[PDB]
Write a protein that binds this ligand. Sequence first.
Ligand SMILES: CC(C)=CCC/C(C)=C/COP(=O)(O)OP(=O)(O)O
Ligand SMILES: CC(C)=CCC/C(C)=C/COP(=O)(O)OP(=O)(O)O
Ligand SMILES: CC(C)=CCC/C(C)=C/COP(=O)(O)OP(=O)(O)O
Ligand SMILES: CC(C)=CCC/C(C)=C/COP(=O)(O)OP(=O)(O)O
Lengths: 137, 138, 139, 138
Amino acid sequence: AIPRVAVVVFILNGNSILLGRRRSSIGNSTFALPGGHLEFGESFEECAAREVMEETGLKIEKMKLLTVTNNVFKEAPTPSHYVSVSIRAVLVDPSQEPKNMEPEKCEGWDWYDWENLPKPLFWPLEKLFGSGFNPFT
Amino acid sequence: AIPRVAVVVFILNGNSILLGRRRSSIGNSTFALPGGHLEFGESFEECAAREVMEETGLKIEKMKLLTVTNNVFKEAPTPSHYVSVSIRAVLVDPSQEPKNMEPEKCEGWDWYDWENLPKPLFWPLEKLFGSGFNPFTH
Amino acid sequence: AIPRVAVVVFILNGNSILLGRRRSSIGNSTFALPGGHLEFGESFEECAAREVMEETGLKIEKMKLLTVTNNVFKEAPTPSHYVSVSIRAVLVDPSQEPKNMEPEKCEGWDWYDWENLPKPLFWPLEKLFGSGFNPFTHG
Amino acid sequence: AIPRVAVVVFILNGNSILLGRRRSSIGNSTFALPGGHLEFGESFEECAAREVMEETGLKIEKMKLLTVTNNVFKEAPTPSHYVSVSIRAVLVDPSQEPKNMEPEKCEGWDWYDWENLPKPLFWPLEKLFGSGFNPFTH
Ligand SMILES: CC(C)=CCC/C(C)=C/COP(=O)(O)OP(=O)(O)O
Ligand SMILES: CC(C)=CCC/C(C)=C/COP(=O)(O)OP(=O)(O)O
Ligand SMILES: CC(C)=CCC/C(C)=C/COP(=O)(O)OP(=O)(O)O
Ligand SMILES: CC(C)=CCC/C(C)=C/COP(=O)(O)OP(=O)(O)O
């Protein structure tokens, strides 16, 4: 077991971000970001665009590195350790709506207002927000 | 082959940072930061202090996250991909001097002024500095 | 697989361009330009006029190079990578209407006004326009 | 045979571009740009950076698409057809010296002033300049 690299994407649309409830043995039914695992030779931005396309069908642009978090899941059915790179992006077409391309992993994607976020948030995301992190600013 | 996580440490001492020439198959003879590979369950700060201890003997404190870089070495003898978390830290004892504690991996560690950095810098470090990154004020 | 060269044609007619919905494993039912694959020894302009003739029956002239785009489809049924040369052209006979000469690749061709383009556009086209590219005024 | 994509790079340094005489069955001994063949999945910029590193060791940045040319070599020993994407770039470190990293394919790289270009230029490059193309102002 070694740390693995993930990229998660804050897709900003107006005052909203895209979230969807996980179907997973880690954080089941909590609201999480679209994201994926970084592949050998891939840039953060190439991974962000690929994962978002794979999971939601959405086309994004104007990507920007935000931060990196250390996310250890000790009590998981298989304990895992992710180092997660956060990327901000916006839609190429602001009217494009997400599709649930991987329903085995997610209940569906929807837009949530920064001032009315749902609960429960996936703990890595809740923890990051609790630190004062704001993807818009 | 998959991306692996490293932590690299800017040890800030006055106006200087610690650098040492690599003895390595990647970036041989270039000036680089002390650093290490993140272990399972380890925090960024724990890895930074441990790697600096292992390589230099220096005791550091007040670790703070600076940024993250993507460093691919496809044409290396062994293709490697590192995601590198940069950490800022200071000496617990500002009079402590570095030792070359892993002398097979580094020619020796010394302090370099921010305004008189040595050449050649390890390419990931040169690339990061070329973006305007400054570890003292970031 | 290796990158392959395509030529795509912006046929400018008044304020309109020619588009048609693809019948394809890639970008199915999205609006795209007439175009074709560059043949060995062929010029961009020859490719543009030939592909437009083959797909639409239209006769074009005054071909001019616009730009080049890199379009990778790693997740297609068959992963593909195209390098697409954009060409501007006009009708030799402005009254000539397109025909759906290759109905296996396209639902049909129509003229669409630059300020009222249809949706959904084929993703390479949407991406190019998103950059501010305008075939009428480019260059 | 099928058209194949190349990328060629105008590395701008002051008023100069990098050129080197080809050792090749096509355009032998003529002055040409660093470049390479586009790989499946690669962006134009990734190819430009990779090819320049492979051939010269130089690190480049600020890459921009310039134009595209159609370069048919019917008279070649193996007739070839290249579609060549021109990319503008600059050095990360303007003091970095080129190396002749593939000395079987190039006699050596040097910087040439825009107002004193060498002869004979590789015909695809000569022909492009003959149209009035200028990589500094495009
Ligand atoms: C700050 C944030 C939001 C960090 C995200 C943490 C993360 C990548 C968890 C693993 O998710 P996963 O679904 O990729 O792992 P698995 O498929 O193994 O459950
Ligand atoms: C200044 C920056 C961004 C450095 C990050 C790049 C990096 C971790 C290279 C590998 O070093 P390594 O010595 O830990 O790996 P290896 O011994 O396998 O070559
Ligand atoms: C028509 C337009 C706007 C094209 C832009 C870019 C592009 C990838 C063309 C290739 O499509 P193709 O149909 O020629 O290739 P394939 O048949 O393999 O899908
Ligand atoms: C200045 C311009 C427009 C150059 C483009 C022309 C070109 C790609 C020639 C082939 O180079 P190559 O060295 O890759 O050919 P080969 O390897 O087949 O000998």
